[PDB]
Structure formats: C-alpha cells, structure tokens
Symmetry: D2
Subunit: 483 residues, 4 copies
Amino acid sequence: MLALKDPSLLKSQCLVNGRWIDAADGTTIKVTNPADGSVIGTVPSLSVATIKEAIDASAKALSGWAAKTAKERAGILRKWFDLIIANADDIALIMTSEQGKPLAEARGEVLYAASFIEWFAEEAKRVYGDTIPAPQNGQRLTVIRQPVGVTAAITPWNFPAAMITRKAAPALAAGCTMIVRPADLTPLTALALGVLAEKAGIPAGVLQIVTGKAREIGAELTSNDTVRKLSFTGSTEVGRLLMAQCAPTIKRISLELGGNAPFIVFDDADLDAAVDGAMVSKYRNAGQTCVCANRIYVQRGVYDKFAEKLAAKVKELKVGNGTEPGVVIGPMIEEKAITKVKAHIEDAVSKGAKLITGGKELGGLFFEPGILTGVTSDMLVAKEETFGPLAPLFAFDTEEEVIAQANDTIFGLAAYFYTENFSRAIRVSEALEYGMVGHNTGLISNEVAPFGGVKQSGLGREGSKYGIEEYLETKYICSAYKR
Amino acid sequence: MLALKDPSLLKSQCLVNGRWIDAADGTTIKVTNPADGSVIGTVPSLSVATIKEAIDASAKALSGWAAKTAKERAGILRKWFDLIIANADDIALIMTSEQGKPLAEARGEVLYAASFIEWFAEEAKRVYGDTIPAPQNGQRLTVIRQPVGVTAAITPWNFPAAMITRKAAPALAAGCTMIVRPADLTPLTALALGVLAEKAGIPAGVLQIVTGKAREIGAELTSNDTVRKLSFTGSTEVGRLLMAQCAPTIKRISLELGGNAPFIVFDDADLDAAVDGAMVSKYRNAGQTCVCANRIYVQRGVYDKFAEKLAAKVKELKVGNGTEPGVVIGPMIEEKAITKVKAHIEDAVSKGAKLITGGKELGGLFFEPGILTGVTSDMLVAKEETFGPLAPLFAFDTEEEVIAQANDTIFGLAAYFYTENFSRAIRVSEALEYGMVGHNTGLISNEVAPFGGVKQSGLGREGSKYGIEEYLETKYICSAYKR
Amino acid sequence: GSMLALKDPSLLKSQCLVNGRWIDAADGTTIKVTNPADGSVIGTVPSLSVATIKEAIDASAKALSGWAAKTAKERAGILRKWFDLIIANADDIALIMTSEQGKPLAEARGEVLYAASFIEWFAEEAKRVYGDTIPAPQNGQRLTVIRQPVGVTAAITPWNFPAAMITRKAAPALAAGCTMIVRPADLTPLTALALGVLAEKAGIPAGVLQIVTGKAREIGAELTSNDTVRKLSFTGSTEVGRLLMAQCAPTIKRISLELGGNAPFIVFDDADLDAAVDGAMVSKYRNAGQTCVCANRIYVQRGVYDKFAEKLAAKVKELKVGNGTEPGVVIGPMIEEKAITKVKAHIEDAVSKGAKLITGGKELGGLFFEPGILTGVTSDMLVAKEETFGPLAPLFAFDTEEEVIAQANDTIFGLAAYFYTENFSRAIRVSEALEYGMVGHNTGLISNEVAPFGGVKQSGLGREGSKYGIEEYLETKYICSAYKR
Amino acid sequence: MLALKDPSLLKSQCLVNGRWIDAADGTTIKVTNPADGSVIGTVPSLSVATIKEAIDASAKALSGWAAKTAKERAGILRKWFDLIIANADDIALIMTSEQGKPLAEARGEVLYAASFIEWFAEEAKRVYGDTIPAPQNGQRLTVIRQPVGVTAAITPWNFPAAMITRKAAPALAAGCTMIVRPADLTPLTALALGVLAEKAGIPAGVLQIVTGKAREIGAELTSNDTVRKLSFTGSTEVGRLLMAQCAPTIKRISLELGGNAPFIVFDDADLDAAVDGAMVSKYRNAGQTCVCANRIYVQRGVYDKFAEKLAAKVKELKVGNGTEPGVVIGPMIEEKAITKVKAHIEDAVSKGAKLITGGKELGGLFFEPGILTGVTSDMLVAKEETFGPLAPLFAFDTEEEVIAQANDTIFGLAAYFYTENFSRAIRVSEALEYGMVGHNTGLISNEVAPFGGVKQSGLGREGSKYGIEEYLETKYICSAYKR
C-alpha cells in the first residue's frame, strides 16, 4: 500500500456529476509505478456514452455556478487551494508513485499547482469590464466579460497536478464548468485533486475528471456542441489534430505544445550561474518538461570551462526510486522515452559529437544523465525534442549566428540566455522568437506571469492577469438614452 | 465610364511587392455592376506560384517594417487615413458600382473604414507591456508584445472597404505585414485602398492585395509556414474549413462569421425609436449583412402597432441604382440571394405568415423590401439567415420565452433589444448570448468598441483597445539579477 | 472586579504599539475611554508626547527598508494572516467597538468583516502592482514604468468606523511596501489597538505598523511637519482636512483625504417606493446617522411625497433604541453631547422655517436620541447646507429632475449621493449629472472593498479600496534606457 | 521687428473669453530680449477683477465643452496640433527672442510642446471606465471618469511652450476648461499658442491666457471656489505656497518643482556615451531646465579621464545670440541667475574645488560654460541647483556611497546613470529616489511616458497614459436591479 495519511485520496473511479463511478462496462487502465513496475491501482476506461452524460451534467451545473458572485466562487476556490496545501505530502507521494519524479519535486509541483488556484480565486473578483467614450452623443458604450460556458481540458503526464490547475482554476474562477481528462499514465494525481475539489464545495458537475482512451474521449469533447472551449497541453501532433477537430463548431481553443528550447551562454555570463541554470532547466523532471533546455549553445571562449563545470555537477546527480532520500533523478516515464534519448545520442555521436558522460541505461526505466560535446545543427537533437536527461552542447562564435540557430525551429515556447551586458540582454531577449525567455535564470515558472508559446508551440496563455480571459467572452453593449 | 476625380484609383492589377501586376498566364475575373449588368473592369486571377512569391516578398518586408518605431508606423498610417478621407467620393463610387449599395452608404462605409486606420495608428503607440511583481527575490518579470509576423486577410463582398481596414490597420500598426484577398465580387475598392497605401508610403511588401480563386489562394495562405496568422470574415461554412486548414501549423486565427440576429421589442419600448432601429438594422445594405436583424421579436401587447408603423416606413424605401438621388435600397448582389429571400417568404406564408408589404422581384437584381407578420419558430427564417430586405415579425409574450428563443441558434454575433426599464436592460443584455448587443439602438458600429462573436459566429475582436493584440504575441521575460 | 466578556482578554489594550513594543506615555498621562451607552469607564490609553511620536517616526523609517525589500508574495502572506486573525476574532473586536463607540453589535460585527475585507483585498493587490513598458519614440531606447512604495506614511482616523477607517489606509500602505503610523480617534482607540495586537500576531514586523494615541493637534502637527513622513491619509471633518493639507504644504507631502459630505437621497415618482424606503432607512439610520455617506437630505418627488413619508414614518416608529449589546437594539446612543446639540439645532432651525417634526427627534436620556423625521424641508434650512450626523430624516419635496439635480449639487461637498428610479434613461442622466465620487442607484448601501471610495470637490482627495487604492501609497518611476542595437 | 512669416502671432494682449484684451487700467509688462536687451513688446498686467471675469467666463464655457463627444474634442485638439506644427519656425523665433535659447532648441521645444496636444487628442477617446464584479447579487458596479471642471495653470520661463501644452492638452482633452498664467519673462510664446488655439476652433472661454503679477493672480486662482484644480511648474518655494493656498477648498493640485539631479558615471560606463549624455543633460538651455544634471558623480577609476573628455566638448561650445548660426549656448535669462552661478563657483573653489574651464562673465547675460573638479558634498552646489552651464564633478568610490549621496536631498525629479552591467542597472535604477531615471542616456523627454517627481519635486504626472487622470474625477456607481 502507499503510506498515505489520508488513504481516501487514492481513487479507482472517475468524478462525474459529483459521484465517483466506474465504467459502464467495468473496463479499466492499470497505473504502474515506473520505478519498480508495481501496479498502484486501476482507473476506469469510460465510454463515449458516459462522456456525453458528463457533458450534459456540466451544462446543467453551469447556470448555478455562473450565477454565483465572483466572491462566492473565490471563497470556494480558496478552500480548494487550502485543502491541496494541507494534503501536499499525500498528493506528492501519489504523483511520485505514478509519474517517477522525486518526492521533493512532486511536493514542489503540488505547491506550484496550488498557486494557480490561489491566484485565480483572486482573479475571479478582478474580471473587469470597460466603459468607452461613445463617438455619438446619446449613447453609452460598455464592455462586460462573461464565462464561455462548458469547457474541456486534456492534460499530460509530465506535470500531473499543475497542468490540471492551470486550466481548471481560471475556468472555474471565470464561472465556467470543466471536464478534465488526465493522461493515462498519471491519472491518480488528478483524481486526488478531485476529492479535494468536492471537499472544497465545488458543486456537482462543475468539475469532472474522466479517464479512458485519448482518441475517443478527445473526439467527443471536440465534436459535442455543448463544449465551447478546449484547452490542451501535450504534443504538437495531437494539438494539430485537436484544433482541426474543433474547427466544425469554431470552438475556442488554448494549446500548449512542443518546444525546442535553446539555452545560450555568452562569454560574459556569470559562468557558475549559467551552470546552475542549465542544471535546473535541463535535468528537472529527468528532462521531461515542455520548457526544458533542448539545445545548450555555449560561446567558444567559455565552451570548455562550461562543459567541464557541467560535468562535475551531472556526475553528482543521484538516480533512483523517487521516494528514496537524496534521489534527484527518477526513472523515465516509459520505455519509448529511453529509446528516443538513445537515438539522439547515437545520431549525434555518428555525426562526430562526443558522449562525455553518462547517457546510459541503468536497468528498467532508469537512465543516466549525460552530456554531449561537439553538437552541431545537422544532428537530430537540433530539430527534435529529446524529452530526457541529455545536455547537448553546441559551440558558437557570434551573437548573430546563435540567434539565427535559436530561432531556426517551428517551435517557440521557452528560451534561456546568460549575459551580464545590459544591451545584449535587450537585443537577445527581443530577438528570440519564443513566448517565454529566462535571462540569467533557468527557472521561469510561476503563476503570475503569462505562460505559453508562439509559432507551433501553441495558442493562448496560462497564469497571470491574462489567463482568465481564455475562459471569458467579451460582450460589447451599445445603449442609447434620452438626454 | 465612372466619373472619378482620380481615375488612377480604378485598378485592373494586383498589388504585389510594391508593383502593380497582372496574372502570369494573363487570366482575369470580370467585375460587373449589379444595378445594370455592365462590366466595370477586370482583375487578375493570380496563380498559387505568384501567391507564394507574394508571401516571400511579405516576409522580406517584415523585418524593416517591424524595426520602425511605433511613432513612424503611426505617421504612415495616418497619412493613409488622410488620403482615404480626401478620396472618399471616388472610393464610394467604385464601391457602389461593384457592390450595389447607395453612394451615401458607400461614403459612410469609407469614413467608417478609414476610422480603423486612424484608431490603430493611435493604438500603435500604446502597445503597453507590463512589469509584474516577482514571487522570488533577485528576479524581475517583464511582459512585452511583439508582432506576430506575416499575416493574411480574406474579406467579403458586403463591406469591401471596412472589412479590409479592420484587418490591415491593426496588423500594420502592430508591426506585421499583411496579404489581403478581397471577394471576387468586389475587388476594386480593395485595389483603390492599395493605391492610397502606396501614396501613404507603406513600403513594398508590407501591404499586398491579391485577387484570384478563393479555394486555391486560401489553401496556399493557410498552408504556407511563413504565414503566422489568418483573419477571415465571411461564411461560417468557409470559416470552419479555414480553421481546419490552419491547424497543421497551429496558426493564429480570427474569424467573424454568420449571425442570426434577434431584434427584441418589449411592451415598454419607446415604440417609435424601436421602429427606427428596426429600419436601420434590417434594411441597411438591403439587409445583406451578418449583423442585420434577421428575426424581429415584438411583444404581443405592441405587436400590431409596431407592424403598422414599420409598414409605413418600409413602403417609403426607394429602390434603384445606387448612384441615383433618393435611392436607399440598391440591387441585391446576385440572383441566388434573391431566391433565398423568396424561399423565406413562401416557406413562411405556407406556414401561416402574412406577407403584408413588398417582397417581390422588381426586375434584374432589384427586390422590394418586405415584412411578414405571424412568423414562428418552425419557419425557415427562424434558423437561416435571409441576407436580404425582409422583416420577419415574431410575436412573444414573456421575457423568458424571448430570451430562450433569441439564444436558440448556433450563432452569437449581434443582437438588439428595446426597453425603457432599467432592470430589464441589465437582465436581457446579460442573458443574450451575443458578442454585441444594441440596447435602444439599431446602430452599434464604430472603431472604438470590440466587434466579434461568441459561439459559431467567430474568434477574436476587431476595433477597440482589444483589436491590436490579435496581431501581437505576448512575451514573458524573467530576469535574474545580483542584489 | 469586572471586565468585558471577551473570549480573548489580550485584545483589550491600555498601551500604544510603538516599534514592536506595547508602551505607556513617558509622563504616564492617559485618555479615558467611556462607554456612551452608560458612562462606565472601559479603560484608558496613553496620551503620548511629541517626543515619543518622533521616536515612532524614526522606528518606522528604520523598519521600512526590510519591509519594502520583501517580495509582494511575502507581504501578502503576512497580510492574509492578519485578515484571517481578524475574522477569527470578530466577535471580540465587535464587542470592544460597540462598547466604546455605541453602535449595535450586529453593526459592529458587520464593520469588522468590512474592515477585514480591505486587508484581504490589498493582500491580493500587493502581487498585482503592475508597471508598464511603453513604445519608445526613438530607436535604441526602451521605456519602463515601475511603482515603488512612497515610504513612511501616517494615518489619522475618526470614531464613526473605528476598525474600517484604519484598515482602509493600513492595508494598502503595507501591501505597497510602506510603513504606517496610525493615530486613531480619542473616542474610539481600543478597536485600533485590538487590530494592532492581531497585526503583531500576524507577523507584521516591529515598526512597520504602529498605533499612537494622544492629542490630535500636537500629534497631527508632528506627523505633518516631520520630513520623514512622505504621505498623510486622513478621514474626518473638512475643517481639519483643510488644516492638515496646509500643514503638508511645506514639504509637499502626498495626501489622501475623505472629508464631509452632504448626501442627497433622491426618490422619483417612478421609483420602487418600498425599496426606496428600505434604502432610506439603511442610509439614514445606520450608525445612528453618524456615517460620512449617510443620507443628509432626502428629496422626494411631489407625486410620491406623501406615500413615502407615511411608509418611512412607520419604519422609524419600529426602530428600537438601547445599549448596543441588547438584543433587538438597532439604534445606539450618540457618541457625545455636542452631536445631540447639533441634531437639535437642525430640528429647531427647520421648524422655525416651516418644516414639521412628524416624529421623534427628542432626547431620551444620556446620549440617547430618538430617531426622527421632518416634512416640509426646504433649501433655506440649515440641513440643506450642513451635515446633521444624527438620526433625523429631512424630507424635501421637489417637482422636476432638473430642479432636484441643481439642488443636489448646490453644495461644496461631493462624497456620496443616492437615487431611486426604474427608468433607464433617467438613471444615466442623474448618475452622470450628480457631482459626487460615489452614487447609489436603487440602493442605500454602496460600501465594499472593490470599488473606489472617495469624494469630489471639498469631500476629499484620492480613493480607497479597489484597483485604484494602492497607488495612493506608490510613486511612479519612469525609466528610459538607451541600448546598443 | 521680428522676421515672422505671420506677424499676427506676436501679441500684446491677453486671451479672455474669446477676445484679445488689455488691462482695464492699461498697465503692461515689457518683454526684453536677453541676447541684446531690446524690448520685444508688451503684454498686459491684468487686475484681479479681470481675473475673476475670466474665471466666470471659464465656468460658463465648461458645460458646452464637456458636453461634446471625445471624438469632437479630439478633432479640435488635432487641428490645434496641426497649426502649431505648421507655424513652428515662427513660434520658435518668438521663443528664442524672449527667453534666449537657440532657434534649434526652440524648434525642438515647439515640436515637443505640440506632441502633447497630439497625444491627449488621442487620449480623449480612451478615457476608459470600468465594470467591477459586485460582492452582492442583484448589483452592478460601474466606474466612470468625468472632467474636474475649471482648472488653472501657472507655467515657468524655461520651457515657455511645452509647459503650457503639457497642462492644457490633457485638461481640454478631459473636458475641462483652463486659465493659463505664463511667466512674466516669457509670455509671448503662450499668446502665440493662444492665437492658434482660437484658429483651431477652441471655443471662447475654454482656453484663456492671462498675464500679470504672479502673487495676485495666483492668490485669486487658488482662492476662487470655481477653480477646482491648479497645475503649477516652477520653484519649490512657490509650490509650497500654492499648495497651502489650495487647502481651504481642498483643491486638486499637480506640482512639478525643484530637482537636484544627480548624473552618475560608473567605472564600467561607456565613457564617451556618458560624456555625450552629460553634455546634453547639463548644457541644453544653458543648464536652465528642471531635469538638468546638477551633480555629476564620477567613479574614481574614470574621473580624470571623464573630466578630460568633458573639457574637450565644453571648449567647443559656441556661445551667442540664439538666432546666430551655430550658437548652442544663449544668454542666461536674468542677472540674478549669473549671480548664483558665480556664487556656486566661489563656494566650490573656496572649499578646494578647481575650476578647470570657463566659468566667467562674457558680458551682458552671456556666461561661459564651465567645469569644476574636486567637488564635494559640503559645497553649495551639492544642495542647491546652479541652474546654469556649470558641471561640478564629484568623485566617488562605491555604488553604495553614490546612491546615498544621490538620494541625500529633499528633491526627486530626474536622475541619470551610465553603466553597462545589467545587474547594476536594476539596482541603481530602483534605488534612486526619483520620478524619472535616464539609464545610459541624457535625453529622457517625450509625451508618452509619465513625467514628474517624488519627495519635494512635486505631485502628479504629465504626459503618458497617466496624464489625463489629473484632470478627471472618478465616480463609482452602484446599481441594484431586479433579478
């Protein structure tokens, strides 16, 4: 058994219209611990019919949830926030168990996840409209914002709590309802957040958590007329399909998709700080975050020193079961993740790169953090996301050249650069074709800043003063009056 | 010939990379006057190969246009605005000639169209970014807003100037370039606007205007990686396809599509003002618009009086060639449109409605403004857009019923209602599921307020403080510093 | 011996909070706090000296650097702890408040939750102090606007809302990263000290918030002359705000003021008449009529004048007057005998000029005064120009919208105004025409934390609450940075 | 006779209620040219009784001006802007003649002055209000902004055009009327703007320009009940008085007062950039601006080398009559000013400073650009503004010491610093207790950013997003409705 302070947090059922249900046909998905292969439990594999019932239940709850005051919805969301915080350790263990990441990371994610609920509880009261000077006398112009309505979220495995709250928080705050389908590999964290949602007083049908086959559930959420808005985080390939599948009813859509993050270290970097930044943006979550450094570009002058410093740190990383003290790298999520990191390694080396450390299988789903030197733009890793604990170090000579290579991608989520020079900070931060830029830091994640991509990395933003509008419609009211 | 003070405004060529060009194969589209059948001129039917050339010219021009200051882009845009106003009469004639609407409406549309250019020239200098309090010490958070890039606009025949400036003004103001494809039925106004763009000093490739097959040109614009944003106004059917076509590269998309606008008259309306608002929202552009009142809901207590008052006004509308004094209703755009109006009349009458005035062909493309009484929800006009000069008057008893009926559509563009009661004003303006609501006025159009739809009526807004952001990408910069 | 029946006795203080310590006056002198319901002495608080005030100001300056250097997130967390603690102690704060000020417990409780709401709101605002980036007119430059705390600030607060007036100033100041010195009214300092106990307990650091009691003139003179204080915020009489603004002039201090009002409450023929009577009852008789936004002049259109008066008169007859801790009591005693004299002067002037006292308006013993109503009130009566600050509804008849607009606006004041109509267009006309910072339409209660509260004309400077409140405690800094392209 | 293309721009009367008038008793103030001493002309010395009539005249005009749409006020203001830009040369000649600055600076100021009118013309249309979520059901919360009413402006001699437009443009844009009293020494530029204001279609009584004794006119403006806001730019001493004078009526008030601007050069500055920045912030207008560098702090490591490079540039400064080709330094404005500049030199040298260059009378009101080295905190120029063409170079050792010294003043208008380090830019820019900070630039002036001070440098801001609010009152409306 998992050693949970509150064992009622671990669920084998879906949350549908305020009840916990199995699949009509009793079919299930096993959830296995990537550290040891042990079966944690099962979750339902819901049918389309049941998904349709969840959608009806969402539409039925919408009226009353939307008709509450912003202050009432905010009080309920703040209770949910407080409940998550009070149960952080349990939730962290569930997550580490199903996802792999070490408990300290899991715990960090829980607090981060919780912060969007807090932040959007506060935003709910700050959904401001406008009055606008009228071009004609005898008219008054107003703009109000109202909830889009029933909404759907589809979320990935790499951040099993935080990708959920980033969508459910602003949606519920705005007065919308939401149905969430968490990834098959990591549904238990979502279910636990659902237990606490119910305990918080989020009424029946406002929030629903459904598990089952991605394609069938995804196709119903995007074809059902009642759903007015989809938010998805995951691969670009699936994002492209979902946008197409929304087109017949012109659904509002938000997408956070693939990246190919460059991480640029200039000769006048604080080099030690650049090393610490690379370590956190490359090796957090075993390299499996959307914003992870994928390509580390280091200027000729500091290349050898940077590589040598990074090796000293990579060599100290403890790999193992996430519940074990001192482990900072967990197992990878699935075997095909390992194959891909291997293919990246083997391609680079066959093109002349040197695997200077690690990058080896350690048994089961465990993989050793590693570094390549001599990496160039003709290698696979230049164009494709590794999604694993591999640091490819690309030499460069000039700022122009690095900016050109950094932007030479269909993606545009996150980028990072280190420099102490004021002017270059301006040029490079502006020239980078990315939604998010870390300057002198590898950790850019919070709830107060808008998160998202340009180009093929997605649509819309999460967090911040800009997040809630993804779940609102703007209404212009033009009123004539007798003067 | 058309009596133009500046005949060089009438073009037979496309604007590609600052040059005026014909098709490579010489092919063309004829532009006819719907009032008399005469041929005004021809425009090219460009090939996809030429469109690809125009897309590259656009990307060539972007860098230089984006690097200008906001202030310099504003100066150029104001210059354009000023040229359009100065040449308003000539533009209005080209418009009436190809499109059909009376000169006075065309003139009104030209000033309206120019107002977007003025508005967004001013908004160029007001693209504000943010500083956000950092959750951690030693960091500072900034948000800036930058041009999306190369953009495309695809525009309809019913407002052949304003639908272009609504799109091109904000794009260009933001630092984007745009390629515009106007409707085959009304391309000459677009080309006229392009001539004044050149004169304004908008550089080669920043604005380009391309004529040709809708499907082929549209397919290239939505499949070419260089194009990063599409903005389309037109049919819902075509908007669905274009969104789907944008999906493989996850393009930013703005759509303004069908409506099925309700116009609601309560017992406590200023009945006379309600009639004037009805006349203005129903018969302008001969009812040929997605914001035109399509369903006129009149509360039982005032139904008869309202019908009588509306008949007297409808019978005064003079139909004829739009260049002719006193004409306020021109020809409809094509024969298929007239048949639709006939279909709505016979369907309704066959189901119990009474055609109390007009509603018959007058020769050529001329159709006589009409009114049906006794219209109900099983009739075709309850669910389909007439796009012509027919007022269907639906009776209702209660606020609740009329709201349910107004909202019973897949669309949500414009709605209108008339009441003197303060509380009803709040209740109805908020319950109406529409992006735009006219209360005691039938005229809601301007450049300062946000225009667009909810539900299947579209994505994004035009005009207002909210319009420019459709052409901007948000960038979050997280900077660490040494305390 | 005896005590208020406090659940937590430690909330009742007899000392001032100065640099994280609870202190008496260097000379031992004190101010006595008396319960206006029965003349019993609740306790004393110190009468501090100007020298002790100067030490509080140095302490505030010393505390400022570290408090401002915290993240918005930390300051918010601390502020939210204070908020949670106020809520958790609301019944005891209410009893303290009712005991010293007079208002009924239900009203006291209501004020504490209202007070607390500013702290919650500003805790949230702290993390939302946004600056700007502005497109540069020249290439090679970048423009930024940041907002930073003004610094050491001072608040001087009245007796009519002994908790809220303090939270409405301290919450935004501290949220912004300022420190604040608060001097509350001699008549009601205990509530303010209770809030200070919970501020400490919340982790507000030594010197960041301080509460000093003593003579208004002397303490106000020091706060307004001392170079260290960069902002004053004051709520009270217009006569005092005039003095205080003059006293900030030598050093150009930032200043916020919420002063006198002369609220017109206007009932048209097309009002929902019962709802207007309810709105009148709440805006006139809450806090026994001693609120800055209380209806002062009640204008009723001739067509509904008679019906309105009869309905109001029936409600006023049911008002129960008594000790604010007694069950059912909705009118407490007035705060002091001069308040009674004024209400009596207003009655006598009105009657001398033709008005009729149709009910109430008599002394009941002690500081108790009977709610009352005048009919036939006109523009030449004193109450047309001066606030009564008592439980007296003066009913002015009017014939047209234009005439009532002109009369409403015929005042140097411009704080709150109210009006009842069901007509959409009139709502627009009247609400825009009224020369007031705050307007209630079809309601007599407009107070909350999320909208900007304050006045035009001689009713004051700046706004409290809302997205606009925190900027009263911030300075705008424009940074123009050149860079190499 | 001044060589003006349009001699109707040179006035000898006041603009009061749409009319040009003299004082009722015929008294006048002579306006002399500081370059040669000739009398340019006279202006009236209006009586208090006449000021009272302007005030009544302003109140009478308020209502009609406020009742206009923003669109309409904006058009009138843009005509005013257009007319100033068309007459720039002549306004420039008038300005150089009366206050002494070169024609090139004069022209620059007219264009700068004009930019405010253009800017607030555009802001008039963007006076936005809010809607706010109501804590109670059945209530809606609105916020609108309306004109404060009749306003007064008192303006200085050093920018005789821009200081007026900076106050009148936002006032008029907001829907206020304004009475301007310009400085005795430089009233003719005001009256010229007045001529164009009339031409522009600014209605009688909306803008008025009155000349006369400062104490008397300002006493009336500050004690008359009708005047609801005063905006004053000038000496701190007079600001302190005007603010106390406003107190008995709780008048709204904007002040921009004394500065004591520190200009800081760190060892890692771009040194020549910093010398060019110093030349421009110290020597424009002969050092007679508000925001001029008064204390030039130079880090020990680069002091002598900076002092050397500054000395080269000062030496090239052509001093002369402003109308003279190549003159970049005009006369000072009055003898009083030379006396103080001389006192600063005497005190400095007596406490050990060396006068390495210039710093002496050239006859008349001309005075030679100078530089002092060895300047220290116990000298006079450390606490008092020279307001002349004298550069005192203070040496410092550490960032911490120079921040302390920078901030060791009652003032907080403008400051400047030069550094190439990113982290230092953050620290110093945030640490400096100033309203405006130039970083690596001496030129910070424009219409789009907010200008004003902290501490005893003033209240309120001019220009930008924030400027118009100084002329608006906020009104909160809380409306109950029947659900």
